[PDB]
């Protein structure tokens, strides 16, 4: 799982799910990519799930880039606790994903298999997404 090696502030306010992505809105490494159409916190467990789905479909002979790193901590209080007594301990690592953000990129020789692989990944993600190419 992707976790940051260290963070300066281990308990953070929730990332704000507002606005359209101003950066990382185009495919820059591969020839195909997955572009988000909705706001979500994408967790490291979802990223792992999606990446392994792409790997299994292409088997070998391709490269997968993950343009998003889950460095934002979300806390959780211990179960069955009343409100108050301080903020919970960090539990989940998420990336703040905005519509327009390209999440995954793939290079593969065959377009049909590439698109199928990315579709397999999209079904793992909490959001709605479309396949985008380097072309206009």
């Amino acid at each position: 799982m992707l976790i940051p090696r260290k963070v300066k502030h281990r308990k953070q306010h929730h990332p704000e799910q507002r606005g359209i992505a101003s950066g990382g809105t185009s495919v820059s490494f591969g020839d195909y990519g997955i572009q988000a159409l909705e706001h979500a916190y994408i967790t490291n467990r979802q990223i792992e799930s999606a990446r392994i789905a792409i790997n299994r479909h292409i088997k070998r002979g391709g490269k997968v880039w993950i343009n998003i790193f889950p460095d934002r901590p979300l806390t959780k209080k211990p179960a069955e606790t009343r409100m108050g007594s301080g903020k919970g301990s960090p539990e989940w690592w998420v990336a703040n994903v905005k519509p327009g953000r390209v999440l995954f990129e793939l290079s593969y020789p065959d377009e049909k298999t590439a698109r199928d692989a990315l579709t397999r990944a999209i079904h793992k993600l909490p959001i709605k997404a479309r396949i985008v190419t380097r072309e206009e």
């Binding site: 211990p78 007594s85 301080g86 903020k87």
Partner: protein, 79 residues
């Protein structure tokens, strides 16, 4: 469980007390600050706590000198 935080000091009411064009008497405090965010200019003194105050009556004028932001007093014309 319990939090190790819950502490803070009093708000010190820092900041600009007299803005551009305001007429001030001599001695009047112009800015309260911690360092020299603003530097003393013409007819402005700097207090030991870095308070800027007027050395003569006039209008407060902000300006830049060599990049340093400065507070100045310009003499007002006598009626």
């Amino acid at each position: 469980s319990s939090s190790r935080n819950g502490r803070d000091s009093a708000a010190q009411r820092l900041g600009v007390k007299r803005f551009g064009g305001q007429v001030v008497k001599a001695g009047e405090i112009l800015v309260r600050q911690r360092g020299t965010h603003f530097h003393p200019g013409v007819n402005v003194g700097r207090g030991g706590d870095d308070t800027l105050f007027a050395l003569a009556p006039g209008a407060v004028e902000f300006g830049a000198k060599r990049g340093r932001k400065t507070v100045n007093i310009v003499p007002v014309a006598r009626p």
